[PDB]
Symmetry: C3
Subunit: 323 residues, 3 copies
């Protein structure tokens, strides 16, 4: 008999408490958040006893939500089209018959010939950009990169509610930019993030990550209850490493890619500088949903709540009557 | 007593009208729209008394759904690695003690020394790419850019219904491309959009936007009722400015980025041309959902409608009986 | 009378069979899948009797989920700023009055003058990068591209369940990479995909696709029932052509774009090599949802199932009683 009143309290609390209140059934929700992100990196480093600025280590440069900060390089200066032996021992050859299709991808096409790369070693000859890259000793990382800064201008808009806000507040001043200390909880509206800080929030050691290369994700969540104050709608920053496989795998441990700088002589012959770039890739991911009170969902939701509590008490009353 | 019939009409109309008809409950919905976008910009401009074509002002060039049309530039010709004084007055120095870590990011690393940039001004010395960029007088914009054209090939497919359509209709002809006048309502299937037109649909003044740089969004919505004719499935174009913060903020008012063109001498020394690019970034965002009649959701939906109207009339009859 | 028991079996089977079991109502679902993709292409080709490696034909190079493999080129060597006649016959001119605004976009700005491109043909003069591109005879494709390989490191994580898996399994070895044969069904965990294979899975002929250029989509779906074994969570590969309009349209049949390589003389004058690139663009699209048993949705779902079967038998009993 008392279980009837208990079931009544559980139905009333669930349908009018969790379902109606905690789940904000009284609210209209806009999930089609409109976002824009623009980035700008600042910092200088020493690599190969040359200074490197944003135009040197950031790629691509258009300042989108995805960019790489190069932290390590294998530089192959002044390549030219020709014939030459492969560098890595993986291509060791003793007989021209060993230079066949079974060989792994290399600097160029295989001539089928076999040449002496050094007095000690002989490898397969190739036609392509010469000489081939040599990966014998590890190259250093750009330590200063740990201090580079990432400027994030993130604009968001829930169009359903014609609501627009950004991580740059309207009262932001040049002094603020010069002196604010970003923190996900303490100061979410500082547009400057320290690269080393982002790396550590992601649970990574800058030395290792910069040695191997990797992909970090900067997630910005705008979950805003537009019923509350405009100043309560704040961004929630989360950080992670997206190439999680890389750490668990020995075959491919990081992130790197190759690109070239192309030159011509007055003579007119082409020559290029090859670059194997290791770096940290930053992905800025913006998500959000908004909700504001609307009478319609309050009517439908409350009516559904009364029909739900009524159906509940009715079914519990019947099941109690028969048993 | 009459309120019973009134509640019956509201239940029947809601559950069989809005819920069943207006909300197309009889329809199966495909929301996993598959989209592809390819772009090509055309136009030429005069900047620095040089002609600039797509290969000069568009970046990146692969013709994806995101590209920049550069409208303004600060060009720093023939930089070389070395030592030189900072250009901007923000780095004004009188004592070598003022050249310390508290200085903002600059063209290069700080030597700690202090040098005379000009007879009137002395600033901190740096090691890096020299000379530093000078932002003393504003550079002009490429006015002709207002007339550039954006060619958008947008392919979409709802795989659930094996339905494929694109903004390029199959009966599109070379004359059409040469002469069609795009309009979101009047002619949605013209693949050529005037840059100035896109800027104005976004509610922007090309002169100012091209002066500051900005991000414009071109939204293409494919909301198609596959029950109706194939020719009723048309794209809905919307335009906006995505970096909405930029206009409300004095600290960062637009969109720009820096990149360099790299050269070598026959002598073999590296030198580069630095570029501070202001431009309009275009983001083509494609969204859509499709629906087609399927008997299953018609059965489940109609049965739910009858159970709903029945439960409604039952509860209203009981509440009327007790009170 | 028997239809009462029939309706009872249909209600019990639907609400406790399809709705509760097949639809995994007992499961909590994570749809906010977190994905990261990194790519690396390998292969060499012969084009213009030059060898071309990843740094030559892949763009952009940062190894993101979207990249192009260039398969065809129209190369315009050593352009310089100046005046010259238009190449294509579309610009045929006989009178300087015909060189007006009605002309289509061209290599540069129009001088209004008219010049002889050849003894046989006269066209409009332009100021810009000279000479203009000549598209008279078709250029060959890089046949070897059919054998290039795409290395895909895809990391995914459902954070709700703190679940992380990737297409590179932890027991992957160098021999595996050197010898595994990717197949969507037979071997989903081989990170190496043959370009020609991807083209054919997409239902395309490499010769034609490489002639016109196109966009291929590589969809990777992680639909995982975390109740089952960790080894049951496997990626589902799908392949398609995303620019479906291109094949059905005569006006624009493929995918290509233009970019330039910039050079300077010791003299200091700028000159560039123009490139019209035809290639296959690969879009790696990752989707997924996960589900794991949770007691809460089992309670709510089972209670909803009993209330549903009860309401069903009640309404069928009443409708049977009155009629
Ligand atoms: C044997 S066919 C093939 N095709 C690819 N596209 C491809 N991309 C990467 N790999 C190989 O797969 C391994 C993992 O790739 P990785 O993380 O880039 O390591 P890595 O920097 O030493 O790669 P490389 O120096 O050899 O270019 C590595 O041994 C690399 O050589 C690839 N192998
Ligand atoms: C003080 S530490 C730091 N780190 C960044 N990554 C960064 N990116 C941009 N800023 C600064 O924040 C301001 C807004 O950036 P902006 O919209 O790019 O203006 P701007 O074009 O004058 O920026 P710059 O010329 O200084 O490169 C501006 O004063 C710029 O110098 C940045 N400051
Ligand atoms: C007449 S105004 C205009 N503006 C564009 N942005 C634009 N982009 C492409 N087109 C034209 O529309 C046609 C289809 O474009 P397409 O697939 O790139 O063919 P295509 O390679 O011959 O284009 P082009 O060689 O002329 O650059 C083609 O004739 C091209 O010239 C464009 N036309
Ligand atoms: C970062 O900069 C601070 C000065 O602001 C300096 O003390 C520190 O050594 C720098 N870190 C690295 C890794 O260079
Ligand atoms: C700037 O405006 C925000 C808006 O809520 C406010 O929280 C903050 O205190 C303001 N800062 C200053 C310095 O006025
Ligand atoms: C350019 O110079 C190099 C060496 O200086 C030479 O091998 C090459 O043949 C020259 N180019 C031409 C077209 O002769
Ligand atoms: C755009 O082109 C038209 C001719 O089609 C010309 O009249 C107009 O002046 C141009 N606009 C600009 C800003 O150059
Ligand atoms: C091209 O086909 C579409 C398909 O509905 C049609 O609306 C349009 O009128 C056609 N145009 C011509 C010129 O036939
Ligand atoms: C290249 O020339 C410049 C000036 O012409 C000179 O400063 C530099 O030392 C030269 N390069 C080398 C490697 O000597
Ligand atoms: C691809 O490589 C194989 C050898 O592994 C060779 O037999 C075949 O001819 C190549 N295909 C093309 C199109 O070159
Ligand atoms: C590697 O681990 C996976 C995990 O399920 C397993 O299926 C596969 O058989 C293992 N391969 C080897 C060679 O142990
Ligand atoms: C560079 O050389 C070309 C031809 O060799 C000449 O036309 C041009 O005027 C030179 N540059 C300058 C600045 O004189
Ligand atoms: Na290697
Ligand atoms: Na500045
Ligand atoms: Na053409």
């Amino acid at each position: 008999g008392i279980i009837n009143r208990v079931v009544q309290l559980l139905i009333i609390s669930y349908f009018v408490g969790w379902v109606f209140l905690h789940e904000k059934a009284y609210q209209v929700r806009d999930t089609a958040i409109e976002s824009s992100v623009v980035t700008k990196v600042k910092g200088s480093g020493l690599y190969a006893n040359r200074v490197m600025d944003v135009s040197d280590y950031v790629t691509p440069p258009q300042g989108t939500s995805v960019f790489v900060i190069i932290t390590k390089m294998i530089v192959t200066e002044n390549q030219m089209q020709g014939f030459c032996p492969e560098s890595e021992e993986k291509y060791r050859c003793v007989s021209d018959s060993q230079c066949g299709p079974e060989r792994l991808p290399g600097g160029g096409i295989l001539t089928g010939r076999c040449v002496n790369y050094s007095s000690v070693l002989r490898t397969c000859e190739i036609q392509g950009w010469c000489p081939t890259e040599v990966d014998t000793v590890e190259t250093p990382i750009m330590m200063e990169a740990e201090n580079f800064t990432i400027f994030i201008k993130n604009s968001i808009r829930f169009p359903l509610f014609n609501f627009e806000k950004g991580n740059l507040l309207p009262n932001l001043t040049a002094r603020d930019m010069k002196t604010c200390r970003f923190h996900p909880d303490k100061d979410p509206f500082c547009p400057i993030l320290r690269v080393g800080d982002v790396v550590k929030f992601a649970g990574q050691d800058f030395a290792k990550l910069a040695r191997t290369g990797g992909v970090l994700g900067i997630k910005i969540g705008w979950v805003c209850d537009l019923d509350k104050a405009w100043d309560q709608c704040i961004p929630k920053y989360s950080f992670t490493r997206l190439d999680s496989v890389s750490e668990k795998s020995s075959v491919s441990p990081g992130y790197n890619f190759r690109f070239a700088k192309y030159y011509k002589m007055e003579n007119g012959s082409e020559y290029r500088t090859l670059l194997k770039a290791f770096g940290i890739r930053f992905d800025v991911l913006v998500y959000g949903n908004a909700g504001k009170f609307n009478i319609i969902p309050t009517i439908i939701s409350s009516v559904a709540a009364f029909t739900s509590v009524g159906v509940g008490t009715v079914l519990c009353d019947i099941i109690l009557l028969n048993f």
